[PDB]
Design a protein around this ligand. Structure first.
Ligand SMILES: [Fe+3]
Ligand SMILES: [Fe+3]
Ligand SMILES: [Zn+2]
Length: 190
């Protein structure tokens, strides 16, 4: 059935507005992560931003046209150091999967928009992992574990793929000569 005049219709636009802002914020934080010398974290912000773009698109496609007024609160700024940015992003993700989406889904179901409710719930799942990544990375920075670990492990240069074995990432990649900032823990998800 139609969405016109429903609360869900307005909830969809409100989410779209918030997701759109998060996309920009994450891309800016990514640029800052690059300046602070954290390449992996920078690309995570950029990818998260791209995923926000997709969450927004799914929501956008439900809308039926015309202008709609919304009343909502959003973060007015700001861009700080990468650790602080990761913390603020995690807070944003948290509000989204614990408060906004669950509420929007419940209301969607209440008004008879089951498919939409399912999407709200599904998106929330993606946001929870987003928060997890942000929180884990913020913790790695706080504990000085981004480029150094307790036991010897494998480090991979994101720029050229060189693999380094040791307790910490090298100051310079011996293959491409790029700085330590480009290294991450060698990952295998397949
Ligand atoms: Fe997210
Ligand atoms: Fe390299
Ligand atoms: Zn999202």
């Amino acid at each position: 059935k139609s969405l016109k005049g429903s609360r869900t219709e307005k909830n969809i636009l409100t989410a779209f507005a918030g997701e759109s802002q998060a996309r920009n914020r994450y891309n800016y934080f990514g640029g800052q992560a690059k300046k602070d010398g954290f390449v992996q974290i920078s690309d995570i912000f950029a990818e998260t931003a791209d995923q926000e773009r997709e969450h927004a698109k799914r929501l956008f496609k439900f809308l039926e046209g015309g202008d709609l007024e919304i009343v909502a609160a959003f973060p007015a700024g700001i861009i700080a150091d990468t650790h602080a940015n990761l913390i603020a992003s995690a807070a944003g993700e948290h509000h989204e999967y614990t408060e906004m989406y669950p509420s929007f889904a419940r209301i969607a179901r209440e008004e008879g928009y089951e498919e939409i409710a399912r999407v709200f719930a599904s998106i929330a799942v993606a946001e929870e992992f987003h928060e997890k990544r942000f929180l884990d990375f913020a913790r790695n920075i706080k504990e000085g574990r981004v480029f150094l670990r307790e036991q010897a492990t494998k480090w991979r240069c994101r720029n050229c793929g060189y693999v380094h074995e040791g307790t910490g990432a090298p100051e310079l990649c011996p293959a491409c000569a790029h700085p330590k900032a480009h290294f991450e823990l060698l990952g295998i998800n397949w």
